[PDB]
């Protein structure tokens, strides 16, 4: 089925870098866009960035400019988010999910739209805490 399994929660020291994984199933792993959305406990949802499984194109939000890399393994049908220079503010839960995708490379607006952003089957979330 449409499904997402993220890796389990982790904790890191400030200034560090963390790598969270997003595995998917139930469709063609190259047929949907991936986005990462974060939620701080005392806050709502925040859109971190985007990766396209097909071909590897990527994009990110201004706030995380410089701080976040996205990669994939097609063979495993899995996406990797990574954040650098971890700081206490970064402590939150992270989420990943999809889009119904025209084709090559990632980001569209005009072609209708995805009609979500980590709400349908983005996964189960995972907790990460930046602490000393």
């Amino acid at each position: 089925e449409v499904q997402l399994v993220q890796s389990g929660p982790d904790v890191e020291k400030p200034g560090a870098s963390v790598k969270v994984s997003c595995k998917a199933s139930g469709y063609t792993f190259t047929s949907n866009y991936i986005h990462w959305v974060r939620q701080a406990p005392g806050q709502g949802l925040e859109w971190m960035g985007v990766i396209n499984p097909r071909g590897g194109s990527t994009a990110s939000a201004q706030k995380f400019q410089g701080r976040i890399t996205m990669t994939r393994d097609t063979s495993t049908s899995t996406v990797y988010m990574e954040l650098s220079s971890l700081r206490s503010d970064d402590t939150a839960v992270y989420y990943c999910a999809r889009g119904g995708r025209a084709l090559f490379y990632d980001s569209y607006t005009t072609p209708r739209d995805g009609g979500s952003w980590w709400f349908d089957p983005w996964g189960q979330g995972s907790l990460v805490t930046v602490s000393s």
Partner: protein, 495 residues
């Protein structure tokens, strides 16, 4: 009304065609039009708003360095290497110095050496582009005829805002009473975007055509960005010292921001704060007036006894607005406004209120008109003749036609052959004009484009000279055309 005082304005007489008219209007300009009927309207052009941009380019005007390891092999053998040369976020260079027993190592020769540096930029340029889509013009089309305050104060509601976008057309507009009006834009005939770039600096922005904005030096970086820090270039930035022999050094280049200003001169700027402010440019609309009442019909002519407030107010060539305040009963009755010669009615003015009208009574209604080149005898009064005001217009016939020709010259310049369209319905020879100058000046004005004041005027005088000494009557095709296009276009441009 909302035109007056802006100078530089566009009187368009008559329509014919059964309907329409061709108006070319921009920003600092505005347009006043007339027909043998229908109320005089004014087209004033305000902010142009392009909504959705998309970001192509990152230029940085300033950076800094740190870390910055370096190496040399010392030998002959080898060209030195360093691991951080791998990440292109560094900058790298090879140079050659020398080494030996002083350096301590091998062989006594002129050595290879390298260096790298981490590279990070604080300041940018946001330059984006907009497709010839959702971008829109906003127009105020204002009626004349009284209703106090200001021939001025473009603020305040009369001519609406009449929005338009290429996405739509036909520009259906309404005003009180007569105010049914149909306009048609041709924005795709506008600035020719996709040739265009909107460039936001720290605040101020500039509209410059694409290629130049591609070829411009200084550190490159593509719209995708996204942590990339991937900057190409940097060789024109961050120069490296190599004093006489030993070692070498790397130097932050220093902000060019001003110099960049010096570059962006010769370009109209643009303010951009929220989403767009865009000014300048120009557009072409065609106007179908069918659909217009005279704003009042079958009345009585005033009664009598007007009492004026203030005086004459010429402004550029003509219009002579006057303000008057009617006193009496008769309710919104026509105002018998006339402009006459000395005595012995020859009467000739030309009146632009056309069909002035009293409102609710008390309210300072106003008028504008065009007396002849000479003495003028203006009369609003009827039953006890009520009033007469002496006027004199200086200037003005030959000089008029002359200055007019100057205007039409400027408009042949600046705006091009859209200028030829700026009249209306000349049948054949207007069209054939627009085409002849179309491809003609298309070849000639450009191709010998990209040139400035100096070289323009100078090339002008030289080619007109070689024309003066040419044979076979072709001198004219040299010569008159030459000197004209060259000189006249020489001083008028680059403003």
């Amino acid at each position: 009304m909302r035109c007056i005082g802006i100078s530089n304005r566009d009187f368009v007489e008559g329509v014919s065609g059964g309907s329409w008219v061709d108006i070319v209007l921009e920003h600092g300009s505005c347009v006043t039009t007339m027909a043998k009927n229908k109320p005089t309207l004014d087209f004033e052009l305000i902010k142009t708003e392009a909504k959705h941009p998309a970001t192509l380019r990152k230029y940085c005007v300033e950076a800094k360095l740190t870390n910055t390891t370096t190496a040399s092999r010392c030998p002959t053998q080898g060209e030195p290497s360093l691991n951080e040369e791998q990440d292109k976020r560094f900058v790298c260079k090879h140079s050659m110095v020398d080494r030996g027993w002083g350096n301590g190592c091998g062989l006594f020769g002129k050595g290879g050496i390298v260096t790298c540096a981490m590279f990070t930029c604080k300041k940018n340029m946001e330059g984006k582009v907009v497709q010839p889509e959702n971008l829109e013009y906003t127009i105020v089309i204002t009626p004349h005829s009284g209703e106090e305050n200001a021939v001025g104060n473009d603020t305040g509601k009369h001519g609406k805002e009449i929005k338009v976008t290429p996405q739509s057309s036909i520009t259906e507009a309404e005003l009180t009473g007569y105010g049914t009006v149909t306009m048609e834009c041709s924005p795709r005939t506008g600035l020719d975007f996709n040739e265009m770039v909107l460039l936001q600096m720290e605040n101020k922005a500039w509209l410059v055509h694409r290629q130049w904005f591609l070829d411009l030096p200084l550190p490159w970086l593509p719209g995708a960005d996204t942590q990339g820090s991937n900057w190409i270039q940097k060789e024109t930035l961050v120069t490296f010292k190599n004093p006489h022999a030993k070692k070498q050094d790397v130097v932050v280049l220093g902000s060019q921001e001003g110099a960049m200003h010096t570059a962006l001169t010769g370009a109209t700027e643009i303010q951009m704060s929220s989403g767009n402010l865009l000014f300048t440019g120009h557009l072409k609309c065609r106007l179908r007036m069918d659909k217009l009442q005279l704003k009042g019909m079958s009345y009585s002519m005033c009664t009598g006894k007007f009492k004026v407030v203030k005086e004459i107010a010429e402004t550029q060539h003509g219009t002579i607005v006057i303000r008057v305040q009617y006193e009496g009963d008769g309710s919104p009755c026509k105002i018998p406004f006339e402009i006459m010669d000395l005595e012995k009615r020859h009467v000739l003015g030309r009146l632009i209120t056309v069909n002035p009208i009293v409102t609710e009574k008390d309210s300072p209604v106003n008028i504008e008109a065009e007396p002849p080149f000479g003495d003028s005898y203006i009369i609003i009064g009827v039953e006890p003749g009520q009033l007469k005001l002496s006027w004199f217009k200086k200037g003005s016939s030959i000089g008029q036609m002359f200055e007019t020709t100057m205007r039409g010259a400027k408009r042949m310049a600046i705006l091009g052959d859209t200028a030829w369209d700026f009249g209306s319905l000349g049948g054949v020879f207007t069209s054939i004009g627009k085409a002849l100058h179309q491809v003609f000046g298309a070849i000639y004005g450009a191709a010998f484009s990209g040139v400035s004041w100096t070289m323009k005027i100078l090339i002008g005088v030289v080619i007109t000279w070689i024309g003066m000494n040419s044979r076979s009557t072709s001198l004219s095709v040299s010569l008159v055309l030459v000197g004209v296009v060259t000189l006249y276009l020489g001083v008028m441009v680059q403003a």
